Structure formats: C-alpha cells, structure tokens
Amino acid sequence: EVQLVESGGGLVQPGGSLRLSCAASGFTFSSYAIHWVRQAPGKGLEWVSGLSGGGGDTDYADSVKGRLTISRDNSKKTLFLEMNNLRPEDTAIYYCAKLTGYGSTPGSYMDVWGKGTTVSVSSASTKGPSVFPLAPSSKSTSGGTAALGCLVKDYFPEPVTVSWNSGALTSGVHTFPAVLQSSGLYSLSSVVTVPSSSLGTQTYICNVNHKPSNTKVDKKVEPKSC
Amino acid sequence: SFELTQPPSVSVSPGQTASITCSGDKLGDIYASWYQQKPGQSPVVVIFQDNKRPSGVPERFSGSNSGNTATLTISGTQALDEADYYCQAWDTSTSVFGTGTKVTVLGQPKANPTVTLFPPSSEELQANKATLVCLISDFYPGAVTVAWKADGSPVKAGVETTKPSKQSNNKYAASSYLSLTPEQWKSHRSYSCQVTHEGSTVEKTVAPTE
Amino acid sequence: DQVDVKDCANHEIKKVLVPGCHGSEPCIIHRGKPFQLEALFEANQNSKTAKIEIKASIDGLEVDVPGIDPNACHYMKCPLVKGQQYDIKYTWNVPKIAPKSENVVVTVKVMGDNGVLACAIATHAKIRD
C-alpha cells in the first residue's frame, strides 16, 4: 500500500543540475517527514537531506549543503530534491525514505524506501564501446572445451548487454561485471566455453548492445591465423 | 558529525549466531536502528529502537545498545540473512549511518578459481593499444588476489582488477585487465596472471605470437 | 480531560490533559487566570536538559507568548532517562492584556541534549475573558 516512486536521475557533466521527485502513495503524506539517502556504487548509505511533514524543517548534510535544496508539494504528494552545481562524488543512487513521524528525533526510523534513481556526474561523455574478438586458444584446454569471447572496451555510460548468436547460445556464456578505469570509461568481457570440435564448423557472433549510444556491435569471433 | 563504526564483514556458518557491532562515542544516550540491504534491493529495517523488531521481521533478529555499542544478533543465521547490514543513529538532526557489515553464510564448500587469460588481439594491436584479460570464475568464498607478471617479474601499472561478484551458482566471479602499448607487449616473452585464493595460487600465461 | 493535539515529532507525547476541556472541542483559556496543562510523554533519549520553545498564532498572525518558563526540568523529574515515561504539569498565567481570539494555533517543541524530545500543535484554544 505504502509506496514511494523516484525519478529524475541521469548522466550530468560536472557543474550540471538535476531535479529528483519522489511520488508517494498509500499514507497521509503530510503527516510524515521524508528524507533522501544516497549510496555511491559499491559503498555504504549516506544521509543527504530531510524535511518535516509541513515542509518546515529542512536539514542537509555538510557535504551537500549549499548545492542541494529539498521541498514538498503536499497536494501532489511529492518530495523534490533540486541538485545544482553537481560534483562527481555526488554520483550515486538516491533513495527517498519515509520516517515514522512528522519530525526527526532520536527515536525516528526510516520505515519505507523507494527503489531508488541513479545520478551520475562525469566529465566523460556518452561513447559506444570498441568491440574486440578474444579468439579461442590454439592449445584449447586439457578438456575438449574451448574458451572464446569479446572484449567490450571504453564505453560510457552503463549499461551494456552482451548476447551470443542473437541469444540462441546461452550455455557456456558468462558475461563478466565491468571495470571502471582511470579514463572514467567502462570495459567488460563475455566468454563462451564451447566444444573444441565445433570451432571449425560452428560460428559464434557476439552481440554487444549499448542503449545509451544507440549502437549495437556484432563481432564474429574466429580462431586466430598466422 | 559523530561516526558509527561497524566491522567491514562477518562470516558465519549455517545455524551459527552472527554478531554485528556498531560503536559510537555516546550511543547509550540515543537510540540505534539497523537496516538490511540485499544486493540490488533497497534497505529494510530489521531493528528499530535498540531492542525492537518490526512485525514481519523474523524472531531470530535481536538488538542491544549497552556500553556505547549497538549489537545486532541474528541467531540461526540462514542463507536468506546474507546481506549488507547498516546501523544508524541521529546526531541531533543528522542521520548517521554506519560503514556497513557484509554478512556471509558459508553454505558451499571451498572452491578454487577457474582462470582464463586472453592475449591482446590483432585488432586492438592495430589500434595502437593492447589489453590483457584475466577472467576468474567459480570460486568460494568470494575473495581473490590478482598478481600480474612480465617475464616472471611483478607488474604494477595498467592493472585494473574488478570486485568479486556472485554468479547464479552462488560462487563468485572476477576480472582483471592489464593495459600496455603494442611495443611493451612485444618487448617481453611472457605475461602471466597469478590468482591467489584460499592459499592456493592458480597461474595462467600468454606470449606474443608474431 | 484529555485533549487532542497533532504531533510534530515522533509520537513521544502519549496523552495531553487540560482541566475541563475535552478532545477537539473548543478549549477556553481565560485571560488573567492561570492555565494548567498536563502531558505524559516518553523520553526518546538520555538528557540532562529540556528547553520549551513556543510559537503561537492569533487569527493567522504570529504572536510573542510572554512569561513562559523555558526549562521543563522545573516541571518534571530531570535528568531524563531514555525509554522511561514522564508526567509534566506546566502552569502558565495568562496576562490580563492577552488578546482575545477564536482562532489559535499553538506549536510547542521541547529540545533536549541529543535532539527534539517532543512536539505538538494545538488548534482548539480560544482566548476569552
């Protein structure tokens, strides 16, 4: 019944601005304080801002103080977070969270949280991946298995989805988590452990899709030749 | 603002009681709550006022705030309890969250990694760049140390290793990439990816090939 | 009897009694006669202090409420112990020249050492002779 729905995140250059909304339902919105809590990739929760039910008490964290402002529209049952003059470190997923009361006190707890919305701040710009073949080992393996794959390198932003043979092949496929480099560009690899006997006859194409850059790349991976 | 310090990780055997601690200068003067964030999901409260469990949260979860230390206590830990746990307390108007304690339940037996090392590609090399890829699969529990070697000697720069993720088999996977110039690649005779897990070192090697 | 107020904190205030008023019905404060007000609340924290802050409004316009003792520790047992229940009995003498009104919103916030102790708004006070 109780539901919060966030929106407004996006890829933004340093110094850019975003407006986050959190649309609530299933409770008397105005009777309850609602707070923002953010979480950088692979890190812990950081409290950002809060606001009493009446919009009376704005409170911020020293880190975001001056650049973020919080607000309510009670008729619309919605919490807002206007983020300006954004900084890379402000890159994270931003959750809104209902408190158990009208006001922040030591007893207060966050009883409900949205699914979150994602803010990314980077001097990077959207760039599709370069896709390189990882040809199968000439020595194969001790077993009759061969490992071939594709290297998805230098892409921004996430996500990239990799399919083999247009999704027909799902057996030995193992796409790996991506790595954020010094460049601020991402790179990932997908590998398919396949029968070594098939290499000559059977064709493997990897389908690398990057919705953000509106490009899909289809690389055929063949054994390397001298 | 005041800081709450929690252990970075707690590993527990199935059915063993886990004990996460949260310490602050004066926390017995205030109330402490606890949130559980399972990967890819939003946080959820499990203990709300030092010693209070929300209707719905399993009876196994308990709390305390004596000695300026708050203590979550999951008795009979199961594989469902396997998540990141964050304590929280109020510095007047500021919500102070703890560092985070990742609880792992050891339900699988120890599993050594499966290393796969691909050399640079003719396509990359033609682009005046060169990247070596070390893919790591099926290891339990989820901790690995990568070392790269060039002609059998430690390499430092270019190494961008990822973070142990969990596969659908509940074993863990990781990658590591070594960037070089085409010339550096050819100047040596072998690069190797040495993966150390549970005291056992698995090594794979590649070499420039005309 | 028991009066109705709206909480502006975290539900620490349990019951609020004003002699001879009831629920959400007009509650008549008389100029020049002492006004008494009892509250039952739960301490959300250890605190040695308790400061009362009043903001009140008369027909929509803010008003300085005078001669209010800000120290609540003069009216309950202090120090406060986290999780224990307390019974405050506050007495404020309404000045003779206090302006009469049929629309009165009063907000009372109590601050402690570690944060807000309690908060409530009351809309049903009426000032008369």
Automatic annotation (TrEMBL), chain C:
Domain MD-2-related lipid-recognition: 5-124
Protein's name in the database: Der p 2 variant 3
Keywords per UniProt: Disulfide bond, Secreted, Signal
Coarse class of the protein's main subcellular location: secreted
SMART domains registered for this protein in UniProt: ML (SM00737)
Location(s) in or outside the cell: Secreted
Organism: Dermatophagoides pteronyssinus (European house dust mite)
Recorded GO CC terms: extracellular region
